[PDB]
């Protein structure tokens, strides 16, 4: 979505790459998130379908997991590396929901960027998510269900 690249500035001289500010950064960060979120969006659920990635030596890898498909996608952008390492943190800890946690984070950065354009501060936005998540975990405790009156290993079978 970003066009017309930022001009090289003579008043601010920093060694290396040029500095860029404003709303273009959060637009570029969300645009970098959609580059990886659209990849994993199709391979979600039973009806979801996956893709192939070649290793430039004839070999390839048909991958369903979010941690594996992002591990081979070496993201040069800094914001994408956070989600790449998150899936490597997700699959090692729990081993489930690797595709959903990236999809949840992508949708959050979408609407969070829309809220920043609506002129509320990110600190109030982060406080809104934390108080909401604290009530969400409290609601997850309410909707629990203890396994009872089940014949044999049926609860372990159907959950697998």
């Amino acid at each position: 979505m970003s066009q017309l690249f930022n001009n090289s500035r003579s008043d601010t001289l920093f060694l290396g790459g040029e500095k860029i500010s404003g709303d273009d950064i959060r637009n570029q960060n969300v645009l970098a998130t959609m580059a990886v979120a659209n990849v994993v969006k199709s391979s979600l659920g039973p009806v979801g379908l996956d893709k192939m990635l070649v290793d430039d030596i004839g070999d390839f890898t048909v991958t369903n997991d979010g941690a594996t498909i992002l591990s081979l996608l070496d993201v040069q952008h800094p914001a994408g590396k956070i989600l790449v390492e998150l899936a490597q943190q997700q699959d090692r800890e729990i081993g489930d929901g690797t595709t959903s946690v990236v999809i949840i984070a992508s949708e959050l950065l979408k609407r969070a960027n829309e809220l920043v354009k609506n002129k509320i501060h990110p600190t109030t936005i982060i406080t809104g998510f934390r108080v909401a998540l604290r009530e969400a975990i409290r609601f997850i405790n309410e909707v629990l269900s203890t396994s009872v009156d089940t014949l044999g290993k049926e609860t372990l079978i159907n959950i697998a």
């Binding site: 950064i25 960060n29 929901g97 998510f129 975990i137």
Partner: protein, 70 residues
């Protein structure tokens, strides 16, 4: 789901709704207990927290500074 949350505590049928939802094979609303769709509670716990910290790390960024390699 809304019709279930709003409901009286004393309403069996409505409360049950709180329990079911989307089906991807047949394309209708059926019970998850009879269908067998189930997940652990630990899978959702600490998943939104990781997504929350993932959102916080990018959302708080204002400017981007890049140093070229030597």
């Amino acid at each position: 789901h809304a019709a279930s949350q709003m409901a009286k505590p004393e309403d069996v049928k409505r409360r049950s709704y709180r329990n079911y939802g989307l089906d991807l094979i047949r394309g209708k609303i059926v019970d998850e207990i009879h269908a067998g769709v189930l997940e652990p509670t630990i899978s959702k716990v600490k998943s939104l927290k990781s997504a929350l910290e993932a959102c916080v790390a990018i959302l708080r960024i204002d400017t981007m500074i890049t140093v070229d390699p030597e």
